[PDB]
Amino acid sequence: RPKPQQFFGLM
Amino acid sequence: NQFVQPAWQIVLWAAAYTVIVVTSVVGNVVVMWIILAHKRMRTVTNYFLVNLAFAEASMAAFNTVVNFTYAVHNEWYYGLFYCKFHNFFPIAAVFASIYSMTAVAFDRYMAIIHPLQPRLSATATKVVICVIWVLALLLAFPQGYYSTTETMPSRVVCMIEWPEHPNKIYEKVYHICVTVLIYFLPLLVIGYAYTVVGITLWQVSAKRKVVKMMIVVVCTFAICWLPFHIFFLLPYINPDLYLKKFIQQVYLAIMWLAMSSTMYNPIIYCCLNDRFRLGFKHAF
Amino acid sequence: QVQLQESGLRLSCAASGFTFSNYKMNWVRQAPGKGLEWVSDISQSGASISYTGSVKGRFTISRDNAKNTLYLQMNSLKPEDTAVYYCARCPAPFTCFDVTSTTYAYRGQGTQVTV
Amino acid sequence: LKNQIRDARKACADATLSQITNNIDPVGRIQMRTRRTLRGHLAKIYAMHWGTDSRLLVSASQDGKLIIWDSYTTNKVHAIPLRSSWVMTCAYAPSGNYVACGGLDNICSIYNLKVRVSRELAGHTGYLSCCRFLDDNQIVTSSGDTTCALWDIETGQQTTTFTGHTGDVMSLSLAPDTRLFVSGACDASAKLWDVREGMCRQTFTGHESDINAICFFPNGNAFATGSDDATCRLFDLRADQELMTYSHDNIICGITSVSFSKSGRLLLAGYDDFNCNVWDALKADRAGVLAGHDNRVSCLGVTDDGMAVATGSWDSFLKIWN
Amino acid sequence: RKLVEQLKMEANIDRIKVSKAAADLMAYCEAHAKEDPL
Amino acid sequence: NEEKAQREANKKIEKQLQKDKQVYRATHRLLLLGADNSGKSTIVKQMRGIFETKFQVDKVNFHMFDVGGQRDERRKWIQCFNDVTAIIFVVDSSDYNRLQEALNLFKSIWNNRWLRTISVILFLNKQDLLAEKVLASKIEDYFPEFARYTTPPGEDPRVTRAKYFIRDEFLRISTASRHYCYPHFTCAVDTENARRIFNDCRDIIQRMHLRQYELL
């Protein structure tokens, strides 16, 4: 949803 | 998918992460066994130490491996249920470990500066530990409630789908509050307590060794946990940076730096106490 | 029964009823009109020795574990040395508290020395 | 004069007990396991005593507390605060109506459980080491002033005084017939007393240091003692001589307590090395060991039934073995 | 004076041969070993 | 049926035992020792069978015991005090003929099996009498080694030399073998002994905690 290129790092 | 890395850039990171996970897990579980397997060591004075060891071991075992394997390619493999569990428990582990360190510092301060007052009771210690864990769970719950899973071309990702708002206030406040409660407060508390204790303490070689170790603890905490918080505060300053390949490298670096901190307590105990040294020598 | 018998200058103290090699030994004196006072003691093996200051360099203690005998050598005697000398044993077999007490079960009847 | 007695005792030495007992079968290995653990005392425990029912018992601690335990359930029945912290002894009345304690205050207090004091027996000039009821009317005590005495509780005055020891009396025990009792003092000697005549019938020697504990043989014709010289010796009233000695070269710590079993075959001793050993009373060999205390064991006791044994230590815990 | 008086009574005991004393303990213990739990 | 009452009574007893533990833990027990020549009673008179004295400094409660109702022999009843916080030793430093007995008693205490972990606060009482005596016995006649001594006070280095020699006499045996000795000079009118004891107990407990918490 946000974008195809986003990374989405997590804690 | 621009986050697919080559083989060698991945192997190089994998070895570095393996070293820290293995050492942290082994050291923490060995110290936990040492404290509990002998009647001489099994005393009220070691409850905070065993709690800290358990928290550190769980942190290293759960958070690090899953975060690494997700960051290598940025593709989720476990499903919705695990995406839910991972944003709930391993983070509570981190918070619990930090506040257990704060409790240990408080105990040492009380034992050194006010030696003639009786130490807290076993019931009080147990209640304090339970409160620590409950607060950690409460602070980590929201991040896990809204965790979801989304499909993309060639990707399925696990992320946090916060409630929509034009200006993004709800998550701004949450991240700012987490930073305040997890970095600035424990740092200030430990810095004051250990500062006073070191000023008081400074055979004097043993006291000065204690002071030197104490300084190391404060400095390592301060230096190691800064970029971890800066990374998660950055997107609300400049979101565009999270669309470039350099971001995953930065994330890997800061995550390794932050998670390396689970290695130092077993080594400090060994270098300080001959009882712990003998325990390690008998375990191995 | 445990027995100590002094005689006698070179004082002698024969012992019986126990392993002489396990216990520390002492010499005690009682001048007329005064209480008991500590003089000297010798360790189990004789490798450690001590004296009261007033007699340092004038007396000499020794023991012979091969025959369970204790000695004391005295010379340059002064008038202040006239007293009754006792041969005492420490209470315990491998460790000396009550040797100077008015009543003590492990010291002899004493011997008379008049200058 | 004494050499005549020595020759007389020597003349009776037909053969040693070891020679006579060379044929009896061995006891064999004895392994015992802890069944219960009693907690609650703040400081080191100093003494304890079983009741006649073999279920209840009392213990004294130097924090200033008396506690009565139900051995079957480990529940606390009574907790009695004392007036002087440094208690050193306690005893249980044969009928269970009364309990007594004493220590450095030179006072023997008797408590009525039917809880408050009922009588205080003042008059000793030194700390109390031991005390034992003969009945609800009479009790016997020993003191650090080298004297033992017999009291009448109702009047609360001494009836007879036993004298002849030169050092502090540390222990005493009553014969099963209730007509005689023995004591040991810090002079390496033990004496046999007659409760009615008030005189010393016999004297025994052979130890090298202070005697810390003493107990009667079940038959009433013998007894054992433990001393700081790290040995235990057995005596016979008829032979007027030592029969056997139990010692080993690997132990250099004194004894704190001794007791017998139901049939008198096992002698149990408590040592300052944080452990207790089991001896074959006849063969004179070490048959077993009890371990689990983290400090010196200060007391021992075998129940009149013979079903169990209890121990106390400076670790502030009581344990029951069976 | 007291020591001599006490020794006078101590020396009058009718001592018995040690063999009988040794035998008595064995006789008691062997008979009563059937009721000793330990 | 009766088991319910028994368990209720057990719980009631335990509730009081828990409350008593806290008050027990908040008070430190001291043993007062010395001969009759020393004015050890004059020390407790400045804070006020077995005699007892209770005084409070900085909200901390101290309980001190003076056992003086027993015979001369003490190797058996001394063991009861194995767990005290500290032992107070008082010496009359003016009477030379007793210094040797005091040293013998001090050495016997220092090396006892059941007392090898108890610190001793050492008081050298009656300094005014010592000064008056020295300013006039010669000390050397009892301890010949004094003639070779050199200092490491108002108008005479001689008194300082004598007092420090006496102090070193105790420190020499103290340092010959986990527990520590704390010497202090004191007069007969010193209103600071409570503070000195407070500071010394503070140091002792701090040192014990430093190892209790595995900090070495």
Domains and CATH numbers, chain E: 1-38 (4.10.260.10)
Does F128 carry a binding-site annotation? yes
User: Hunting for tokens 């014990």 — which residue is that?
Assistant: F208
B77 touches A at CB < 8 Å: no
B/A Cβ contact: 3+ pairs below 8 Å: yes
How many Å apart are CA F80 and CA D64, to the nearest integer?
A: 13
Looking at beta carbons, which residues of chain F come within 8 Å of C56? Answer: 144
How many Å apart are CA F155 and CA F136, to the nearest integer?
A: 14
CA-nearest of D195, D234, D188, D194 to D215 is: D234
The verdict on a CB contact (< 8 Å) between F216 and B112 is no
Distances (CA, A) of D67 to D129, F25, F78: 19, 20, 25
Give, for D150, the enclosing helix (H) or strand (E). Answer: strand D148-152
Cβ-Cβ pairs closer than 8 A, A with B, add up to: 43
The 3-state DSSP class for residue D240 equals coil
Query: What domain range is C36 assigned to?
Result: 3-113
List all residues of chain D from 79 to 138 with a beta carbon under 8 Å from chain E. Answer: none
* DSSP for B222-252, written as a single string: HHHTHHHHHHHHGGGT-GGGGGSTHHHHHHH
In this structure, what token pair is assigned to residue F78? Answer: 């001394």
The verdict on a CB contact (< 8 Å) between D186 and F9 is no
Torsion of CA B28, B29, B32, B36, to 10 degrees: -170
How many Å apart are CA F81 and CA F71, to the nearest integer?
A: 17
Give, for C106, the enclosing helix (H) or strand (E). Answer: none
**What type of residue is B36?**
L
In this structure, what token pair is assigned to residue D138? Answer: 């009479």
How many Å apart are CA D85 and CA D105, to the nearest integer?
A: 9
C-alpha Rg value of chain B to the nearest Å: 21
CA-nearest of F182, F208, F179 to F196 is: F182
Q: How many CB atoms lie within 10 A of CB E6?
A: 15
List all residues of chain D from 227 to 246 with a beta carbon under 8 Å from chain F. Answer: none
Does F125 carry a binding-site annotation? yes
B16-283 maps to which CATH number? 1.20.1070.10
Torsion of CA B224, B228, B230, B236, to 10 degrees: -170
Distances (CA, A) of F60 to B115, F5, F29, F82: 11, 40, 12, 22
Structure resolution, Å: 2.5
How many Å apart are CA D37 and CA D39, to the nearest integer?
A: 7
The verdict on a CB contact (< 8 Å) between F214 and B209 is no
How many Å apart are CA F50 and CA F68, to the nearest integer?
A: 6
Minimal-distance CA residue of chain D relative to C20:
D208
- The answer to whether B251 and A9 are in contact (CB under 8 A) is yes
Looking at beta carbons, which residues of chain D come within 8 Å of F49? Answer: 105-106
A/C Cβ contact: 3+ pairs below 8 Å: no
- The answer to whether F177 and F111 are in contact (CB under 8 A) is yes
The verdict on a CB contact (< 8 Å) between F205 and B108 is no
- The answer to whether D194 and D178 are in contact (CB under 8 A) is no
The verdict on a CB contact (< 8 Å) between D167 and F82 is no
**CATH label of the domain that carries residue C8:** 2.60.40.10
**What type of residue is C92?**
A
First to last CA, chain F: 54
User: Hunting for tokens 């005055």 — which residue is that?
Assistant: D157
**What type of residue is F162?**
A
Give, for B70, the enclosing helix (H) or strand (E). Answer: helix B65-73
The verdict on a CB contact (< 8 Å) between C103 and D166 is yes
The verdict on a CB contact (< 8 Å) between C93 and D210 is no
- The answer to whether D225 and D190 are in contact (CB under 8 A) is yes
Give, for D311, the enclosing helix (H) or strand (E). Answer: strand D309-313
B13 touches F at CB < 8 Å: no
Dihedrals phi, psi of D23, to nearest 5 degrees: -100, -25
Burial B176-210 (b: 16+ CB within 10 A, else e): eebeeebbeebbebbeebbeebbeebeeeeebeeb
Dihedrals phi, psi of B5, to nearest 5 degrees: -95, 160
F1-213 maps to which CATH number? 3.40.50.300
Q: Alpha helices of chain C — where are they, by DSSP H?
A: none
How many Å apart are CA C98 and CA F80, to the nearest integer?
A: 17
3-class SS string, chain F: CHHHHHHHHHHHHHHHHHHHHHHHHCEEEEEEEECCCCCHHHHHHCCCCEEEEEEEECCEEEEEEEECCCCCCCCCHHHHHCCCCEEEEEEECCCHHHHHHHHHHHHHHHCCHHHCCCCEEEEEECHHHHHHHHHCCCCCCCCHHHHHCCCCCCCCHHHHHHHHHHHHHHHHHHCCCCCCEEEEECCCCCCCHHHHHHHHHHHHHHHHHHHHCCCC
In this structure, what token pair is assigned to residue E22? Answer: 């040794």
Cβ-Cβ pairs closer than 8 A, D with F, add up to: 57
Dihedrals phi, psi of B68, to nearest 5 degrees: -60, -50
Domains along the sequence of chain D with CATH: 1-321 (2.130.10.10)
Dihedrals phi, psi of B140, to nearest 5 degrees: -90, -10
Dihedrals phi, psi of B117, to nearest 5 degrees: -90, 145
